[PDB]
Design a protein around this ligand. Structure first.
Ligand SMILES: N[C@@H](Cc1nsnc1O)C(=O)O
Ligand SMILES: N[C@@H](Cc1nsnc1O)C(=O)O
Ligand SMILES: [Cl-]
Ligand code: NA
Ligand SMILES: [Zn+2]
Ligand SMILES: [Zn+2]
Lengths: 259, 259
């Protein structure tokens, strides 16, 4: 009968600081796709909640040496949060330590280029060197390449892990900025959802090119064995069938379009 | 320990009888995406299985009066099958009575028209009468239109439910044949997966038009509480991350392509 601690991450357009946040308190300080989703899930599940941005600003990965989980996954694993409502990718290694609802959004790894870049696919990136390319420093995308057995992807990984300086970035915003200021000499591998979002934001100079490299989804996560998981899983399905999710995506992705 | 009874359905290209099937026995009589998926899953979960075609040839719905489930879901809820490996859509009503693995395939409801039919969208079908349209007699698609609040879809449901003669079909093949021999006076609403497949088969006279009406996925189902569920779910995720599911999709949809 207590307030649910929701761990989430500052990633546009999922969770963003409201323009006048410093004059607001609690949940009213945030806005975005996941903020709207959180209010809906909590309303349909009947619980009070509190949104908290993940301290280290990470999604979640296990450190090879210490074996400790960081990011939003870590907050769930070590009991700091009761639930995670964010663009957290459903992956095998995560599913082994936390529970995931059925996906509320479908997506895939994609390529983000500065308009004009002579690249139309991952294959293209692999068969050249002039243009550098990387992914987020930790998360499902980097893990995807590091584990792939498909020649093209494995080849891109061989290059990325040894590239110097590092082609990996700490945050999505860091990757987008790097694409924008690299005169077309840097491409960024990120999930199609974020790629499509950025493509509709000023200065409208980036572009999603080629098809997705894979298919997967984002799910609402809870600690392994949490009682909350069952209800939340059922709420996601109901909200999807009633069109809420489609409406929310259009709202934050296209209605707000700047291009 | 014991051979796992797999319930499935004859739906191309998921499960199909091989050409020389009469000379074969057991699982060897079948071929297809789901047949391969089944083998893979059984290999990684370590068990023997028997493929059985669902008796009433239905996906699964609950009779409003008797409250009895039919089709594959019915076989699972009543203990006739241990698992269902087929293109069974993850939904709220089904999730309430059976367990679903994370989706092994993403899809949406789509429109199939005979080439040349003057229809580009759902809205187009709703604003006219000359062209009849309907869905599978029972399944997630028919349910979607019945539980739809969206004006366009709702309007389509009113027409379909009252239409005469009936526009609903017992099987997808029947829906497809109806479109093909109706001079374009009938459009069939079915899942994008089947639509895309048919679009690539002779006589090559059908088309998937417009975008998907919704987003959802297929999941491997198991009786609620089943022990096999956990391992199967982790296996689906493993196969997706290794690229196998993408491989099978290309193999059965486009490598086989005839148009
Ligand atoms: N959604 C990913 C992080 C991410 N966002 S864009 N590229 C990425 O890797 C994760 O949940 O780890
Ligand atoms: N996959 C659906 C049936 C179906 N296949 S193509 N159009 C449809 O409605 C179900 O699982 O009920
Ligand atoms: Cl046997
Ligand atoms: Na109505
Ligand atoms: Zn395998
Ligand atoms: Zn009845």
């Amino acid at each position: 009968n207590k307030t649910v601690v929701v761990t989430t991450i500052l990633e546009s357009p999922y969770v963003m600081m409201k323009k006048n946040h410093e004059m607001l308190e609690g949940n009213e300080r945030y806005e975005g796709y996941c903020v709207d989703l959180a209010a809906e899930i909590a309303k349909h599940c009947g619980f009070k909640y509190k949104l908290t941005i993940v301290g280290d600003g990470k999604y979640g990965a296990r450190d090879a040496d210490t074996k400790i989980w960081n990011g939003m996954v870590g907050e769930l694993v070590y009991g700091k949060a009761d639930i995670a409502i964010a663009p957290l990718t459903i992956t095998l290694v995560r599913e082994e330590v936390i529970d995931f609802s059925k996906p509320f959004m479908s997506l895939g790894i994609s390529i983000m280029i500065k308009k004009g870049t002579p690249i139309e696919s991952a294959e293209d990136l692999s068969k050249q060197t002039e243009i550098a390319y990387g992914t987020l420093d930790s998360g499902s995308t980097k893990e995807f390449f590091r584990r792939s057995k498909i020649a093209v992807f494995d080849k891109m990984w061989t290059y990325m892990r040894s590239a110097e300086p590092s082609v990996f970035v700490r945050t999505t915003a860091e990757g987008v900025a790097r694409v924008r200021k690299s005169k077309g000499k840097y491409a960024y591998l990120l999930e199609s959802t974020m790629n499509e979002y950025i493509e509709q934001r000023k200065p409208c100079d980036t572009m999603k090119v080629g098809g997705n490299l894979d298919s997967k989804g984002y799910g609402i996560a809870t600690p392994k064995g949490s009682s909350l998981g069952n209800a939340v899983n059922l709420a996601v399905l109901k909200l999807n069938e009633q069109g809420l999710l489609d409406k929310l995506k259009n709202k934050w992705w296209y209605d707000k379009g700047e291009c």
